[PDB]
């Protein structure tokens, strides 16, 4: 199986938040990871906690869906959370895609998306890079999908994790590296950003300006 997690979850300090782990016998362990640090076991089985983990964290499971709940958020709870489990496949273990839990400290902000086509100078260097810039959003969690015409593209995609701007909102960048032939062999390319359930999509074409 594979474990699916929502990309984002948020709550104000003192509020409660619950994140879900869905998998395609069946039970789930949870891990917490702060930036630059190793993962930390928060809860295993349904609701057993290691020593030192606060009682704020609790877990449950309903059929296919395992859940992790945090009951009074503290700003130190802002981190990425992964679930892990056994697998029906070859591998012994699978981890979830990951959920960033944001402890809200400012109002939510919708992202701004700017998509740059390859410059003619880079094409002269036999390269072509699409630059998708996502800015001025909060919480700092986005998902980026690329399209060639209407076909999704996964290869050649690199995306940075959101970091703060000068005005304390988040920014992120995404790149699609193509050959100059790949760039000119399609009608258009699109960068699609998903933030808090909403989607912004920008499109560029080889015949610009």
């Amino acid at each position: 199986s594979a474990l699916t997690q929502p990309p984002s979850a948020s709550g104000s300090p003192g509020q409660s938040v619950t994140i879900s782990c869905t998998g395609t016998y069946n039970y789930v362990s949870w891990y917490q990871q702060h930036p630059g640090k190793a993962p930390k076991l928060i809860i295993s089985e349904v609701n057993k906690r290691p020593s030192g983990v606060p009682a704020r964290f609790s877990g449950s499971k309903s059929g296919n869906r395992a859940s992790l709940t945090v009951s009074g958020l503290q700003t130190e709870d802002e981190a990425d959370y992964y679930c892990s489990s056994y697998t029906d496949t070859n591998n012994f273990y699978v981890f979830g895609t990951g959920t960033k839990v944001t402890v809200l400290g400012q109002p939510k902000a919708n992202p701004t998306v700017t998509l740059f086509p390859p410059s003619s100078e880079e094409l002269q260097a036999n390269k072509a890079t699409l630059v998708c810039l996502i800015s001025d959003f909060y919480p700092g969690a986005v998902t980026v999908a690329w399209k060639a015409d209407s076909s999704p593209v996964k290869a050649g995609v690199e995306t940075t994790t959101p970091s703060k701007q000068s005005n304390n909102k988040y920014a992120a960048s995404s790149y699609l590296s193509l050959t100059p032939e790949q760039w000119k062999s399609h009608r258009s390319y699109s960068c699609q950003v998903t933030h808090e359930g909403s989607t912004v999509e920008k499109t560029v074409a080889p015949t610009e300006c």
């Binding site: 789930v28 362990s29 891990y31 990871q33 640090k37 190793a38 993962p39 930390k40 076991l41 295993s44 089985e45 290691p50 992964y82 892990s84 489990s85 056994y86 070859n90 591998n91 012994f92 273990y93 699978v94 981890f95 979830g96 895609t97 990951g98 701004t112 700017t114 998509l115 740059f116 410059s119 003619s120 100078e121 880079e122 260097a125 390269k127 890079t129 630059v131 810039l133 800015s135 690199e158 995306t159 940075t160 994790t161 970091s163 701007q165 000068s166 920014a171 992120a172 960048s173 790149y175 590296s177 920008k202 560029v204 610009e208 300006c209």
Partner: protein, 227 residues
Amino acid sequence: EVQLVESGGGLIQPGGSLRLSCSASEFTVSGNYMTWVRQAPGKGLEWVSIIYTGGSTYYADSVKGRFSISRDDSRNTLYLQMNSLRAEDTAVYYCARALKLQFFDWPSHAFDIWGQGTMVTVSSASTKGPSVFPLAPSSKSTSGGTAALGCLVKDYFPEPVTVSWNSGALTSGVHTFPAVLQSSGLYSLSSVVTVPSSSLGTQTYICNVNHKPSNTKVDKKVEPKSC
């Protein structure tokens, strides 16, 4: 206190070999199940391999036939031999203890003791100066009277790169993104400044890219590259 400390990572060429070691303190590697977990930069956790108490080993499909986990009880250390390394293998490798299921001699998916990790970077690159390309403003990067323009700093090694605009005279509205590690082993970042759209005709915008490792400084004027 119980500790795990990984070691052995660094720069290695594709196809080369590298061995990571996992030394334990205040608890024994012998009677525990030990795992390896890696994480590519800016990505999620991926399980790598596990060794049982009596010696059974299992590997992920993305690593089968190329990696090998070992146990040395004399030094109380855990090993991970990595051969035929690819650019998919560059990651922070973590060493973790897997709690055993109570009723059976089977490891659970609960890893309670972790190391700090060691960075492995698979790349053929050495010192390489960056290539700067303009991100010119156009009708699609302008909205509400403000214009976005930037510089694409591409294919340099190693970190870091510092970017300024107009020799530091332009700091407001500037954001330089973190670098990304490409499959070719080289780094790339972008830096953008948000300016008034009416200034695009008169005001000059120049990004100043500095790469001290290669002793390279590149000045690039960004203008509306009209056709």
